[PDB]
Symmetry: C2
Subunit: 66 residues, 2 copies
């Protein structure tokens, strides 16, 4: 995987961005979030994830809350 | 986003393929499956999904049972 920190996440809209050291912020949608908790993230949360290419460009897949 | 049907799914391994009328089969991993409950699919299940491109090639994202 790839490690990052959530930059921001809007729990009403269901999306945000993950900040990665020395790379561009990666879009994250709630549908990519793993686990049985609520499909939400909060600023500063540590996550692991894969980058995939969707029709709008890079986005996160397999987002696991650490 | 589009619709298809599960072609086969190995429950133990957690992956299979979605068939698409008129198109190529799409790999699906359990981590893409939406909703509550145990992440699994049965052959013949109707689904909606997105296609994304990862390091291993095209695969499904946002798989919703229909
Ligand atoms: Na086909």
């Amino acid at each position: 995987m790839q490690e990052g920190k959530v930059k921001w996440f809007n729990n009403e809209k269901g999306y945000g961005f993950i900040e990665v050291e020395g790379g561009s912020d990666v879009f994250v949608h709630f549908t990519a979030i793993q686990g049985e908790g609520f499909k939400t993230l909060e600023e500063g949360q540590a996550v692991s994830f894969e980058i995939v290419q969707g029709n709008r460009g890079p986005q996160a897949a397999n987002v696991v809350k650490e």
